[PDB]
Amino acid sequence: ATQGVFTLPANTRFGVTAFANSSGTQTVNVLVNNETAATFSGQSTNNAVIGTQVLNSGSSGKVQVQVSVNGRPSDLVSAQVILTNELNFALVGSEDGTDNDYNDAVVVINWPLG
Amino acid sequence: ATQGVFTLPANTRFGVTAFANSSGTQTVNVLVNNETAATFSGQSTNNAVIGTQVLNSGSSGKVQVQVSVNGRPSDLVSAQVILTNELNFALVGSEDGTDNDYNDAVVVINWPLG
Amino acid sequence: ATQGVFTLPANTRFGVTAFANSSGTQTVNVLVNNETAATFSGQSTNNAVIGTQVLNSGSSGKVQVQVSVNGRPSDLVSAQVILTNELNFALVGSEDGTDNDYNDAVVVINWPLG
Amino acid sequence: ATQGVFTLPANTRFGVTAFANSSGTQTVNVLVNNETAATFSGQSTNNAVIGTQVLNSGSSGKVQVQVSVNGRPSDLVSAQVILTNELNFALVGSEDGTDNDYNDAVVVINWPLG
Ligand SMILES: C[C@@H]1O[C@H](NC(=O)c2ccc(-c3cccc(CN)c3)o2)[C@@H](O)[C@H](O)[C@@H]1O
Ligand SMILES: C[C@@H]1O[C@H](NC(=O)c2ccc3[nH]ccc3c2)[C@@H](O)[C@H](O)[C@@H]1O
Ligand SMILES: C[C@@H]1O[C@H](NC(=O)c2ccc3[nH]ccc3c2)[C@@H](O)[C@H](O)[C@@H]1O
Ligand SMILES: C[C@@H]1O[C@H](NC(=O)c2ccc3[nH]ccc3c2)[C@@H](O)[C@H](O)[C@@H]1O
Ligand SMILES: [Ca+2]
Ligand SMILES: [Ca+2]
Ligand SMILES: [Ca+2]
Ligand SMILES: [Ca+2]
Ligand SMILES: [Ca+2]
Ligand SMILES: [Ca+2]
Ligand SMILES: [Ca+2]
Ligand SMILES: [Ca+2]
């Protein structure tokens, strides 16, 4: 199944935050309407926040997270969870290796903001 | 029901990261084994990361998030989600007012690290 | 925070299914647009499926679950999770006593159908 | 990433329930310790329950859901959600075709029971 693709309400502000947990340099690209809107890179085995940003879902509401290491796309796992019918998290894990910890880059999208 | 309380595997590193979305300064306490292990304070209406840290679950595995604003405990909402039977997210939202956006302080706990 | 309330897409079929795990007789009411649309009852300590039904979310998409035992409202916990940006589960747990297993009545709402 | 695999505590009673939403006849196998512990089949486009059972996680704690149609394994999606640090849901969706609704067989695993 496709992973790392989320439909937000249109014209909604959201946060996106990436964490790194690998010997490999993570490249995290965040697309909105199929266009890169944020990019983060870094290497950490201590959960560094390699980037955080605030974006708007725009007219399409389409948000995609891609994770690659040195040009190689990592395997993605994702889901969306909603608490009290209001608070939204879109979650991504990624595996760049063989150990299957799926934490090599971890991306969390949150909304609403404000 | 109790919210903001999570049982992690014992003696395991985990990340904890807080965001603010409120006109009021947020005070986030992270307890491990019923004792303060980290404290974050900050103010934003645009999802600023007011703190991030790496902690150890220690012998109890017991992690509790509390959020207070001007000394009043905020109402919490929480859950844990596990992806590919491996990647763990413990999620917290908080409400300090009347609008019920539950994003006033948003707390994400992630494990494993590394 | 409010629990057991979910906004579904409007005018969409969904499944609602209740399970019992208590010595108490569970009564589960499912409201659509603030009116009772389904009522399930039963007693089991072995996860009986006391009811399952297909409903339509109607014009508001508002679905609410309430649980009671002998007229006493149970305390509810809930969340929604979405898999591969398509497959939706709205989940309810309920507590009628003092052990805090929150499984006394368990309700699962699923969509899409078909 | 692997999907439909869950680690339960050892020797834990759990509910598993399956629904069908396809023209294809679903076969759902639930493995415990890599051995078939329950098999369900049915066909519905209206979310009919095609199986429900109570099983034991046994010494391994290893639970796997497999879905096939006409001898062909369906593509799975899965996640685990924990409410109030106590109530567990292990959720499975499956796709047997080309529409990507991932509801062809929907499987819910819940614990604790009792
Ligand atoms: C921007 C909005 O900020 C709201 N919070 C408050 O308004 C708040 C936090 C503390 C206080 C506060 C303290 C002391 C005296 C007073 C009364 N003047 C008030 O107000 C959020 O709930 C909302 O979702 C929005 O993000
Ligand atoms: C420290 C360990 O790092 C592993 N990743 C690596 O070892 C790794 C992955 C991709 C790479 N591309 C270039 C060098 C390189 C190295 C991770 O997959 C593993 O989970 C763990 O975090
Ligand atoms: C077997 C146990 O049953 C408990 N519930 C009860 O024993 C219970 C709760 C409410 C009641 N109202 C009238 C009779 C009655 C009995 C549950 O709360 C507990 O989790 C466990 O399932
Ligand atoms: C009614 C529709 O049925 C679809 N499935 C099928 O039409 C389907 C899938 C696999 C099959 N193998 C043999 C016959 C056969 C038929 C489903 O994939 C689709 O989502 C929808 O529920
Ligand atoms: Ca890895
Ligand atoms: Ca790693
Ligand atoms: Ca608020
Ligand atoms: Ca707010
Ligand atoms: Ca109980
Ligand atoms: Ca019970
Ligand atoms: Ca299908
Ligand atoms: Ca289908």
Residue numbers in the entry:
A (entry chain B), B (entry chain A), C (entry chain C), D (entry chain D): 1 to 114
Provide the publication's sentences verbatim.
Co-crystals of LecB with the dual ligands 2 and 9 were obtained with a resolution of 1.55 and 1.74 Å, respectively. Both complexes were solved in the P21 space group with very similar unit cell, and one tetramer was observed in the asymmetric unit. In particular, in protomers B–D, the electron density can be attributed to the indole derivative 9, while unexpectedly, in protomer A, the observed electron density corresponds to 2. The observed mixed complex results from inadvertently transferring a 2 cocrystal in the cryosolution containing 9, resulting in soaking that compound. The amide 2 is observed only in the binding site where its conformation is imposed by crystal contacts and presents the same interactions as described in Figures 3D and S3. The fucose scaffold of indole derivative 9 maintains a consistent position and coordination with calcium ions across all binding sites. Notably, the indole fragment is oriented such that its NH group establishes water-mediated interactions primarily with the backbone carbonyl groups of Asp96 and Val69. It is stacked against Gly24 and presents slight variations in orientation, which seem related to the conformation of the side chain of Asn70 and resulting van der Waals interactions. While 1 presented several conformations for the aglycone, mainly as a results of crystal contacts, only one binding mode is observed for 2 and 9. The benzene ring of 9 (purple in Figure 4A) and the first one of the biphenyl fragment of 1 (light blue in Figure 4A) almost overlap, while the furan ring in 2 (green in Figure 4A) is rotated by around 40° and does not lie in the same plane.
